Scaffold this active site. Structure first.
Site, mmCIF file in Angstrom:
data_model
loop_
_atom_site.group_PDB
_atom_site.id
_atom_site.type_symbol
_atom_site.label_atom_id
_atom_site.label_comp_id
_atom_site.label_asym_id
_atom_site.label_seq_id
_atom_site.Cartn_x
_atom_site.Cartn_y
_atom_site.Cartn_z
ATOM 1 N N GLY A 242 -16.868 26.763 -24.483
ATOM 2 C CA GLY A 242 -18.016 26.005 -24.013
ATOM 3 C C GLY A 242 -18.101 25.909 -22.499
ATOM 4 O O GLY A 242 -17.536 26.737 -21.782
ATOM 5 N N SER A 243 -18.818 24.899 -22.004
ATOM 6 C CA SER A 243 -18.937 24.664 -20.566
ATOM 7 C C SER A 243 -17.795 23.751 -20.136
ATOM 8 O O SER A 243 -17.891 22.523 -20.234
ATOM 9 C CB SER A 243 -20.292 24.060 -20.224
ATOM 10 O OG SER A 243 -21.294 25.057 -20.161
ATOM 11 N N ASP B 18 -9.301 20.145 -31.082
ATOM 12 C CA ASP B 18 -10.210 21.077 -31.757
ATOM 13 C C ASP B 18 -11.207 21.583 -30.717
ATOM 14 O O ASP B 18 -12.125 20.855 -30.322
ATOM 15 C CB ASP B 18 -10.903 20.439 -32.955
ATOM 16 C CG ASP B 18 -11.633 21.465 -33.818
ATOM 17 O OD1 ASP B 18 -11.932 22.572 -33.315
ATOM 18 O OD2 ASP B 18 -11.927 21.155 -34.985
ATOM 19 N N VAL C 134 -13.442 27.532 -16.685
ATOM 20 C CA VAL C 134 -12.417 28.081 -17.555
ATOM 21 C C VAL C 134 -13.047 28.436 -18.897
ATOM 22 O O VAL C 134 -12.693 29.443 -19.496
ATOM 23 C CB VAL C 134 -11.255 27.110 -17.753
ATOM 24 C CG1 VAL C 134 -10.547 26.843 -16.434
ATOM 25 C CG2 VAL C 134 -11.763 25.825 -18.355
HETATM 26 C C1 LIG Z 1 -7.827 24.955 -20.947
HETATM 27 N N1 LIG Z 1 -8.403 23.690 -21.390
HETATM 28 N N2 LIG Z 1 -7.691 22.546 -21.222
HETATM 29 C C2 LIG Z 1 -8.479 21.583 -21.675
HETATM 30 C C3 LIG Z 1 -9.704 22.083 -22.142
HETATM 31 C C4 LIG Z 1 -10.919 21.410 -22.694
HETATM 32 O O1 LIG Z 1 -11.865 22.066 -23.126
HETATM 33 N N3 LIG Z 1 -10.936 20.079 -22.650
HETATM 34 C C5 LIG Z 1 -12.077 19.321 -23.141
HETATM 35 C C6 LIG Z 1 -11.998 19.042 -24.622
HETATM 36 C C7 LIG Z 1 -11.033 19.654 -25.409
HETATM 37 C C8 LIG Z 1 -10.916 19.352 -26.754
HETATM 38 C C9 LIG Z 1 -11.768 18.429 -27.350
HETATM 39 C C10 LIG Z 1 -11.568 18.084 -28.788
HETATM 40 O O2 LIG Z 1 -10.469 18.215 -29.316
HETATM 41 N N4 LIG Z 1 -12.632 17.637 -29.461
HETATM 42 C C11 LIG Z 1 -12.496 17.239 -30.849
HETATM 43 C C12 LIG Z 1 -12.114 15.758 -30.904
HETATM 44 C C13 LIG Z 1 -11.622 15.201 -32.235
HETATM 45 C C14 LIG Z 1 -10.402 15.869 -32.881
HETATM 46 C C15 LIG Z 1 -10.098 15.222 -34.229
HETATM 47 C C16 LIG Z 1 -8.880 15.833 -34.919
HETATM 48 C C17 LIG Z 1 -7.663 15.752 -34.031
HETATM 49 C C18 LIG Z 1 -7.938 16.435 -32.703
HETATM 50 C C19 LIG Z 1 -9.152 15.822 -32.005
HETATM 51 C C20 LIG Z 1 -13.800 17.608 -31.570
HETATM 52 O O3 LIG Z 1 -14.566 16.740 -31.980
HETATM 53 N N5 LIG Z 1 -14.057 18.915 -31.685
HETATM 54 C C21 LIG Z 1 -15.156 19.445 -32.498
HETATM 55 C C22 LIG Z 1 -14.805 20.813 -33.058
HETATM 56 C C23 LIG Z 1 -15.987 21.422 -33.810
HETATM 57 C C24 LIG Z 1 -17.123 20.431 -33.928
HETATM 58 N N6 LIG Z 1 -17.567 20.004 -32.589
HETATM 59 S S1 LIG Z 1 -19.013 19.254 -32.512
HETATM 60 C C25 LIG Z 1 -18.719 17.538 -32.707
HETATM 61 O O4 LIG Z 1 -19.774 19.706 -33.633
HETATM 62 O O5 LIG Z 1 -19.527 19.476 -31.200
HETATM 63 C C26 LIG Z 1 -16.464 19.528 -31.731
HETATM 64 C C27 LIG Z 1 -12.751 17.832 -26.568
HETATM 65 C C28 LIG Z 1 -12.861 18.137 -25.223
HETATM 66 C C29 LIG Z 1 -9.605 23.460 -21.946
HETATM 67 N N7 LIG Z 1 -10.482 24.427 -22.238
#
Ligand SMILES: Cn1ncc(C(=O)NCc2ccc(C(=O)N[C@@H](CCC3CCCCC3)C(=O)N[C@@H]3CCCN(S(C)(=O)=O)C3)cc2)c1N
Length: 329
Positions: free
Chosen positions: A28-29, A158, A27
């Protein structure tokens, strides 16, 4: 015991995952998959070379720490994290499993009733009260970072133009920032849901700031007192020269309580901007606000954020967190 992994190639990327996750499709990786344990579709994200460098290793650690902390209905949660490695010496790949999001806020809007706006913004603010209580700032809130299902239920995440929702103190490089940078973004999002158009659609950041200042006005004396440098004080006045717009005109037709709330979110001085917890008590959310069901977060250990460590140190800390993970119920 350790699960059986199987190997697969997709979009030139090697995927090695426990057999419980079947029918991977990109559907990054990120792949959608079917979680056989529970019967539901999930998303699996394979981090891209997580320990190739110091900055990658720390960002890998940070995202895992943040995901492991989030236990709130309006914030994305971590269902699983795994590595094919059997030991720290072999540890090179990290996989994150979350719920699968069918649509973001943009997809949903492609016009909402005032009731839908109340409920959506209520949920954003409820999730923000939670992350802000842990001293976590989102900093890039925008409709594409908001998952919404067909039942209007919302989660903050995010995925990593930001510009249109960004707080002016950030775009001006002012000294102090606080958590209410996220509240500015909420105001910009709520405005768009009510009017159907981007509130501040700047072509660049200077254009952006000019559009902001003609609505919320040039800084008052109390705000100007906190700006150290003469050149910054002069500059913000250079940018506040377009003919002034007024909230009442911009939001004609909106619930008057919504406009009152917008005026409290879109405040230039971040010391005076309404907080998430305060906003939840605003009359606009009277139909949804419940002080017994707007929880704060457990303490979150951010002491790692100030550290300058070697790649192997960040890697070992990340390995520790992979191993200690406990699935939610
Ligand atoms: C259609 N679909 N459905 C699900 C998904 C999916 O992809 N699911 C995997 C996924 C999704 C989102 C996240 C995520 O939100 N990562 C947050 C977690 C912290 C935050 C903190 C504020 C509140 C929200 C969560 C975070 O750290 N995100 C950073 C954003 C920029 C900086 N990076 S970096 C550390 O530099 O690499 C990452 C992680 C994995 C998809 N495509």
């Amino acid at each position: 015991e350790r699960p059986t992994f199987y190997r697969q190639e997709l979009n030139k990327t090697i995927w090695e995952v426990p057999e419980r996750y079947q029918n991977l499709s990109p559907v990054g990786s990120v792949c959608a998959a079917f979680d056989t344990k529970t019967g539901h579709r999930v998303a699996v994200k394979k981090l891209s070379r997580p320990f190739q460098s110091i900055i990658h290793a720390k960002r890998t650690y940070r995202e895992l720490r943040l995901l492991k902390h989030m236990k709130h209905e309006n914030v994305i949660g971590l269902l699983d994290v795994f590595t094919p490695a059997r030991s720290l010496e072999e540890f090179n790949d990290v996989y994150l499993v979350t719920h699968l999001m069918g649509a973001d806020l943009n997809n949903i809007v492609k016009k909402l009733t005032d009731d839908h706006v109340q409920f959506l913004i209520y949920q954003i603010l409820r999730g923000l009260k939670y992350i802000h209580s842990a001293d976590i700032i989102h900093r890039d809130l925008k409709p594409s970072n908001l998952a919404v299902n067909e039942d209007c239920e919302l989660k903050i995440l995010d995925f990593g133009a930001t510009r249109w929702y960004r707080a002016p103190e950030i775009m001006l490089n002012w000294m102090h920032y606080n958590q209410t940078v996220d509240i500015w973004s909420v105001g910009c999002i709520m405005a768009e849901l009510l009017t159907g158009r981007t509130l501040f659609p700047g072509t660049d950041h200077i254009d952006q700031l000019k559009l902001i200042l003609r609505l919320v006005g040039t800084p008052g004396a109390e705000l100007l007192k906190k700006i150290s440098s003469e050149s910054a004080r002069n500059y913000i006045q250079s940018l506040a020269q377009m003919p002034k717009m007024n909230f009442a005109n911009v939001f004609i037709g909106a619930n008057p309580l919504a406009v009152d709330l917008l005026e409290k979110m879109l405040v230039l001085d971040s010391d005076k901007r309404i907080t998430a917890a305060q906003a939840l008590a605003h009359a606009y959310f009277a139909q949804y606000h419940d002080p017994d069901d707007e929880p704060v977060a457990d303490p979150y250990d951010q002491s790692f954020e100030s550290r300058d460590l070697l790649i192997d140190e960040w890697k070992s800390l990340t390995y520790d967190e992979v191993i200690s993970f406990v699935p939610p119920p």
